[PDB]
């Protein structure tokens with residue numbers, strides 16, 4: 110039993126809510142919040158800009174040190190950093206950004222990173238300003254992630270569409 114509230118059950122292990130992931134993080138303080146990152150960990154907009162803003166830019170400062178030491182992530186890859194005031198840890202996961210012309214096939218690899226964590230609060234990877242089909246991303250999530258994932262969808266119309274079309 111955990112502290113997430115008002116989530117709709119999609120499958121055995123995947124739940125979904127129309128909510129601001131930042132506000133969900135502040136309320137639950139999960140062990141892991143997932144960031145929809147890019148390979149440079151430059152947290153400008155979307156989930157990343159929103160999470161980073163909520164940390165008062167501490168996420169960005171930590172991320173810049175990470176990149177200076179390790180270089181960029183791979184598309185489909187991830188790293189574990191601090192969750193700052195939002196969570197114990199932040200799992201920065203790079204899904205493909207279709208508006209950058211990146212390989213849609215790497216979305217499954219991106220979701221595989223979730224399987225290293227028993228429970229996660231996460232956004233829908235590659236959706237929103239990342240430009241992929243969100244119905245497709247949800248199918249990949251449910252078909253790839255085996256651990257317990259609580260998906261927070263910001264856009265109300267998007268949430269309603271995702272629920273109403275889910276197989």
Ligand SMILES: O=C(O)C[C@H](NC(=O)c1ncnc2[nH]ccc12)c1ccccc1
Nearest residue numbers: 145155156159232235236237262263264
């Ligand atoms: O769920 C959605 O609508 C799509 C989602 N976007 C956000 O979660 C989001 N975007 C902008 N400002 C925000 N402030 C608090 C949350 C938030 C998303 C998923 C994957 C990549 C990029 C974006």
